[PDB]
């Protein structure tokens with residue numbers, strides 16, 4: 001049968017809470033049903049084991065999403081030529097090339113630049129005097145600087161492509177076309193950058209990708225451009241969301257902030273714990289479609305149906321994490337799926353971990369008395385969650 005399709009997503013947008021419907025879903029035997037704003041209805045997987053099977057078992061596909069009206073919260077399905085929309089062997093081809101610039105070995109040399117950037121930003125916040133906006137004055141410039149210089153997109157255009165990002169991630173039903181319109185404008189902008197790099201190469205990933213295209217014929221011109229778009233958006237928006245949400249969690253329960261003040265060596269383990277607890281997205285991971293008939297948590301997923309994964313819910317599955325709703329900065333074997341799991345495991349994860357570690361490290365060192373100093377504007381009707389503006393003091 002088909003359980004009553006529930007209104008998805010659930011919410012909320014404020015705080016780090018997960019809708020009670022997620023808890024009721026994990027407790028329910030089998031997979032529940034959901035109806036996203038656009039597209040067909042699909043199953044929702046919320047249990048850790050069930051989530052990891054849909055994410056990492058080759059019997060599920062991301063490529064099959066183009067021959068379906070995929071469940072989604074945004075009207076426009078760009079169908080980008082990115083590795084995330086493909087299966088093997090195409091995914092393997094793209095990921096093998098682009099991953100080289102994002103491994104631990106590759107980004108570790110960036111830690112000093114990030115560290116110094118954070119302290120320089122903190123110098124400016126101190127000089128100006130409280131209050132400061134922890135987003136615009138800290139959380140945003142850090143990841144934006146890194147990705148611009150890694151990718152090769154001018155830092156001075158961040159306002160322009162920031163505005164395009166906001167429209168591309170909006171789920172507001174009003175202006176239901178700004179997304180597709182503004183992504184096309186972003187297509188033209190990125191095309192202009194790629195053209196300039198092909199003309200006059202530089203020491204950035206775009207030039208490296210051009211070379212792999214023009215010389216090695218390892219990817220199409222379309223693949224090259226869509227990866228530039230995704231890397232630029234994820235490169236700066238994701239970390240800009242997590243930094244202020246992480247700090248909010250540590251300040252909300254100030255024992256956590258104090259432990260890190262006393263034991264900075266715990267920062268890596270703490271960052272992992274917060275990646276498990278702090279939700280990035282407002283909904284669920286992109287749909288996976290079953291290539292054959294298979295059983296997922298008691299339910300028989302029908303070959304051809306979409307299964308969504310509630311990563312934040314599976315990260316709070318009490319069957320895998322003791323006291324799932326508590327923050328344990330020293331949680332052992334903390335194999336959360338905050339960065340996904342399997343074939344499409346987050347490629348920027350080494351870079352994201354580094355950025356969060358250094359972002360926190362600098363605040364703890366310089367602003368131990370940090371305190372929220374006003375109303376926190378949270379993101380609403382966007383594909384991601386977190387403080388839009390965060391007034392802070394010290």
Ligand code: HEM
Pocket residue numbers: 055083084085095102231234235236238239242280285286311337338339340341343344345346347348349351352
């Ligand atoms: C807090 C920061 C971040 C979080 C929480 C995060 C989370 C995730 C998750 C959960 C996935 C898999 C989604 C799914 O399977 O449905 C993913 C994939 C991906 N992420 Fe991230 N991400 C972050 C930052 C970044 C950054 C900075 C980059 C820079 C390039 C990036 C690039 C990618 C790419 C390319 C993929 C797809 C890889 C593939 O399909 O094989 N992410 N991320």
Ligand SMILES: CCCC[C@H]1CC[C@]2(CC[C@H](C)[C@@H](C/C=C(C)/C=C/[C@H](O)[C@@H](C)/C=C/C(=O)O)O2)O[C@H]1/C=C/C(C)=C/C(=O)O
Pocket residue numbers: 071072073078080082083084168169183226229230233234280281282283284285286287311383384
């Ligand atoms: C190479 C592409 C990797 C995409 C991942 C980014 C991280 C993550 C983690 C789980 C989150 C719930 C989703 C939320 C979606 C985000 C951040 C979308 C961003 C935007 O669409 C970027 C990727 C633009 C691409 C473009 O080509 O215009 O984001 O999951 C992935 C996004 C899934 C999406 C966009 C599902 C959907 O809404 O159908």
Ligand SMILES: [Cl-]
Pocket residue numbers: 320321322331332
């Ligand atoms: Cl545990």
Ligand SMILES: [Cl-]
Pocket residue numbers: 335
């Ligand atoms: Cl494991």
